[PDB]
Each structure stands twice: as structure tokens, then as C-alpha cells.
Amino acid sequence: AFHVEGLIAIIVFYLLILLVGIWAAWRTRDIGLLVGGFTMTATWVGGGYINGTAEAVYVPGYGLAWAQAPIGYSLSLILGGLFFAKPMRSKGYVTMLDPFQQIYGKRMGGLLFIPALMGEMFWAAAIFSALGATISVIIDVDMHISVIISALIATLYTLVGSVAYTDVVQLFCIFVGLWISVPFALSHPAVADIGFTAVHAKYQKPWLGTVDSSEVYSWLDSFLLLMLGGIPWQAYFQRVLSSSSATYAQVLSFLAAFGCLVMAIPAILIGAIGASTDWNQTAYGLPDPKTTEEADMILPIVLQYLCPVYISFFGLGAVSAAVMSSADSSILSASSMFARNIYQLSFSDKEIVWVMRITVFVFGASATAMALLTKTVYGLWYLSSDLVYIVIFPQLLCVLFVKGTNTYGAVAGYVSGLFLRITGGEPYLYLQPLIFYPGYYPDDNGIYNQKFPFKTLAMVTSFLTNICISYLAKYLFESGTLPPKLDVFDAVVA
Numbered sequence: 085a086f087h088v089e090g091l092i093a094i095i096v097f098y099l100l101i102l103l104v105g106i107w108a109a110w111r112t113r114d115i116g117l118l119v120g121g122f123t124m125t126a127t128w129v130g131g132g133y134i135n136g137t138a139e140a141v142y143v144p145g146y147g148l149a150w151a152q153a154p155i156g157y158s159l160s161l162i163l164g165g166l167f168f169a170k171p172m173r174s175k176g177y178v179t180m181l182d183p184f185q186q187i188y189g190k191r192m193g194g195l196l197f198i199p200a201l202m203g204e205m206f207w208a209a210a211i212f213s214a215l216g217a218t219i220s221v222i223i224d225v226d227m228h229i230s231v232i233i234s235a236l237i238a239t240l241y242t243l244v245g246s247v248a249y250t251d252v253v254q255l256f257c258i259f260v261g262l263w264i265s266v267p268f269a270l271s272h273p274a275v276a277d278i279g280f281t282a283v284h285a286k287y288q289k290p291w292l293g294t295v296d297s298s299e300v301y302s303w304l305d306s307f308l309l310l311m312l313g314g315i316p317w318q319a320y321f322q323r324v325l326s327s328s329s330a331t332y333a334q335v336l337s338f339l340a341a342f343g344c345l346v347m348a349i350p351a352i353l354i355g356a357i358g359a360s361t362d363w364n365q366t367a368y369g370l371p372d373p374k375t376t377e378e379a380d381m382i383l384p385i386v387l388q389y390l391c392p393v394y395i396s397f398f399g400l401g402a403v404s405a406a407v408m409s410s411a412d413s414s415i416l417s418a419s420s421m422f423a424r425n426i427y428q429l430s431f432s433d434k435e436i437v438w439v440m441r442i443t444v445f446v447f448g449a450s451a452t453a454m455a456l457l458t459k460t461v462y463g464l465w466y467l468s469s470d471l472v473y474i475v476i477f478p479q480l481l482c483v484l485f486v487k488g489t490n491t492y493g494a495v496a497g498y499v500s501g502l503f504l505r506i507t508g509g510e511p512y513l514y515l516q517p518l519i520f521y522p523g524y525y526p527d528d529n530g531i532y533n534q535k536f537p538f539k540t541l542a543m544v545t546s547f548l549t550n551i552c553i554s555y556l557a558k559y560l561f562e563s564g565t566l567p568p569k570l571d572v573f574d575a576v577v578a
């Protein structure tokens with residue numbers, strides 16, 4: 085059942101956004117602070133953000149209490165503005181890896197680039213999965229072909245090619261579409277009372293969620309993963325260092341956190357509506373999306389099957405076009421980081437452009453393949469911050485706040501963090517945990533899952549190992565136990 089009208093809607097809204105950007109460039113009370121706050125909010129908020137929030141609220145075992153990524157990233161923005169924006173702007177860095185390049189050298193920064201590249205790839209895979217889900221819902225095509233086509237269009241749009249203040253228009257379109265679809269979705273006769281199902285169970289488990297007494301250590305272990313893992317991203321620090329003054333950067337960070345908190349509310353409402361929906365009354369029919377293994381597509385479904393045809397047309401086409409336009413930002417950030425940091429220095433402007441094109445194509449292909457293999461948006465969203473939290477965040481803390489850090493401590497903390505992360509086991513990769521922390525339980529798949537906060541323990545172990553090995557190596561080279569010819573990374577001598 086191919087839908088021509090949905091394709092017309094997404095094309096019309098995409099071109100409307102494009103000509104609004106052209107008009108804004110054509111034009112070019114001091115309201116630039118609010119515009120900057122909107123533009124910084126639009127970096128995090130997108131298809132992946134709202135789709136992951138709706139999926140996390142929708143899934144019966146997790147609910148709202150486990151939908152920690154929006155709140156965690158808002159608190160990450162607040163913490164960045166409070167504590168990290170000022171020291172980064174004090175020393176005048178250009179990119180996020182520049183402190184790593186200056187302190188640990190180019191090689192160890194190259195090793196640090198791999199978790200950052202993996203996190204950007206996971207984030208882009210989540211964005212592509214959400215975009216393909218929305219497009220496959222509006223046009224009613226197969227999920228895989230929709231994902232491949234949308235990723236191809238985004239890759240070619242990045243490859244070739246105005247475009248001024250487009251992020252503000254994208255965020256406004258997302259906001260208007262979601263907040264117009266919500267009142268019509270709430271009034272659908274299939275949807276039950278949203279307040280009643282928050283604390284009561286009629287179709288599935290209550291969407292508020294419950295946390296057991298034993299899970300409190302794990303829940304915090306997850307929450308600190310999202311609150312602290314969302315800080316070291318390149319896209320945020322680019323905007324922080326682009327700001328004129330440090331106080332201006334702090335105010336933009338606070339406004340972006342407030343905007344993220346506001347934009348999380350319609351996604352939570354859509355997830356709650358999907359949790360409360362009786363799908364027999366709708367045109368979707370049994371089985372429900374969770375039995376269809378289409379839970380990660382809950383936001384496009386609710387906007388499509390619980391809203392009138394004109395409201396669905398307008399709002400969901402606007403959301404589709406805004407997500408499609410905002411899908412490629414992570415591609416540009418990761419590819420620019422690849423061109424600037426590791427290729428130009430560690431590994432001609434025409435060569436830079438050619439490598440830019442090649443790495444955009446490779447990043448897009450890897451992201452769309454990873455989107456094809458996975459079956460969730462919030463899972464990729466959470467796993468994107470995992471390696472950043474384990475690896476990048478302790479190194480960022482050491483370079484910014486710890487005086488006297490070395491490449492020895494960097495390497496030791498890297499190895500310790502990877503060891504404690506891998507030996508804890510990954511249920512997604514069917515990796516058996518080598519170290520059996522107390523409280524371990526077996527899931528349905530037969531793989532043992534850790535309930536102990538081993539990820540936060542890995543982060544703290546990496547940080548303490550960095551500090552301890554750095555100062556121990558300083559003492560060894562000062563006292564004369566190890567000669568200056570023995571060193572490999574030459575951290576002490578330089």
C-alpha cells in the first residue's frame with residue numbers, strides 16, 4: 085500500500101525548510117542568545133532522541149523510570165555548562181581531541197578517537213533507524229529499503245551541499261508536529277486514561293515503571309553512565325568553544341538543557357499513549373508493536389494510527405522532514421573530526437576534501453548497516469555513551485582537572501577500563517562475563533547479567549589508575565630508577 089501523499093508531504097516540508105534557510109541566508113532586540121540556545125538544543129534533539137524516549141517509556145519492563153537518557157543528557161548539558169565549558173574556553177582549544185593531542189600526544193589521542201568514532205557511529209545508527217522508521221511509516225514501505233534510501237539521501241546531501249538558521253526551523257517543526265499530534269492522540273477512543281495506566285496495569289505493565297531494592301545500584305550505574313557519558317561529545321564542545329565568552333557558553337548550555345527537558349515531554353507523552361493504546365480498535369491491529377518487534381517504531385506509529393489523516397499528514401510529514409534534515413549532523417561532526425585530528429596530522433586541501441567525501445561515505449554505510457542489524461533505538465542510544473563513559477570521560481577529567489597526568493596513566497587507564505568493561509560481559513554481543521560480581525542473574529537468553537555497578541566501578545578504576553600510574557611514573561623517573569632512555573611515550577621528559 086504505497087502512500088503517494090506521504091511522499092508529497094515529506095518533499096514539500098523538506099523544500100519548505102530549505103527555502104526558509106535560503107531566505108534566512110538572503111536576509112543576512114539582541115535575541116541571539118535565544119537563537120543560540122535553540123540551535124544548541126537542536127544538536128541533541130532529533131529523530132533518535134524522541135524515538136528512543138518513546139521506546140523507553142513504551143517497553144513494559146522498563147517504563148518511564150528507566151527512560152534516563154533524556155534526563156541524563158539534560159543534566160549532562162547542565163554539568164557541562166557548570167564545570168567543563170569554562171576550562172575548555174580558558175585554554176582556547178579548537179576541537180574536543182585537542183587537549184588529548186597536546187597532553188598525551190598524537191598517537192594516544194588516535195587511540196582515544198576510536199571510542200569517540202564508535203559512539204558517533206552508534207548515535208548515527210540510532211538516528212538512521214528512527215528516520216527509516218518514520219519514512220517507512222509515512223510511505224508504508226519496507227523498513228530495510230526505507231533505511232537504505234534515507235541514509236543514501238542523507239549521504240548525498242552531505243556529499244554535495246545558503247542553509248542558514250536551519251536548525252531552529254527543524255526544532256520548531258519537530259516541536260509543532262509533536263505538540264499538535266499529542267492532543268489528537270490523547271482524544272483517540274482506543275487510548276485509555278493516561279493517568280490511570282501510569283500506576284495501574286490494563287494492557288501492559290504501568291508506564292511509570294518500578295525499581296526494585298536490588299536494582300538501585302544498577303539504576304544509578306546506568307544513570308551516571310548517561311549523565312557523565314554525554315559530556316565529552318565533540319558536537320557540544322564545538323558549540324562551547326564557538327561562543328564569544330565563557331558566560332555566554334554557560335547560558336547557552338543551560339538554555340539547551342531547558343530545551344531538551346521541554347522537548348522530552350511530548351516524547352514521554354507519546355510513549356505513554358502507546359503504552360495505554362488498545363491496538364484492536366486502531367487500524368494497526370493485533371499483534372501490538374511490542375509483539376511485532378516494532379517497539380522502537382512506536383513514535384511514528386502513534387502519530388500515524390492515532391491521529392486524523394490531515395493531522396497525521398501535516399505533523400508527521402513535518403517531523404519526517406525535520407528529522408531527515410537533522411539526520412546528517414553527526415556525520416559532519418565525526419567526519420570533520422576524522423579529517424582534522426587523525427588524518428591530517430597523525431596520518432593538501434584537495435586531499436582533505438577527497439578524504440572528507442570518502443569518510444562521509446564510509447561512515448554513512450557503516451551506520452546504515454548497523455541500523456539494519458539492530459532492532460532498537462534506545463539500545464543504540466544507551467550503548468553510544470557506554471564507551472565514552474568508560475574511556476573518554478576519565479581522560480577528560482584527568483586532562484582538565486588533574487595536574488601532572490601522563491601518557492602512562494592514559495594507557496593504563498585505557499587498558500583497565502577496557503578490561504573491566506569486557507570482563508563484565510555484554511548481553512547484546514553474547515559475551516560471557518569473566519568476572520562474576522555479586523548479584524549476577526541469568527536472563528532468558530542464558531547469558532549472565534551483572535546487577536553490581538561494574539560500569540561505574542570501571543570508570544572509577546580507570547580514573548584512579550590514570551592518576552596512580554601517572555604519579556608513580558613521575559616518581560620513578562624523578563628518583564632515577566628508570567633512565568630517560570627507557571621511556572617509550574616520552575611523557576616525563578617533555
Ligand SMILES: COc1ccc(C(=O)NCc2cc(C(C)C)no2)cc1OC1CCN(C)CC1
Nearest residue numbers: 140143146150306458459460462463464466512
Ligand atoms: C529502556 O529502553 C530499551 C528498550 C529495548 C531494548 C532492547 O534490548 N531491544 C532489543 C535489541 C537490542 C539490540 C542490540 C544490538 C542494540 N538489538 O535489539 C533496550 C533498552 O535499553 C537498554 C539499555 C541497557 N539497559 C539498561 C537495559 C535497557
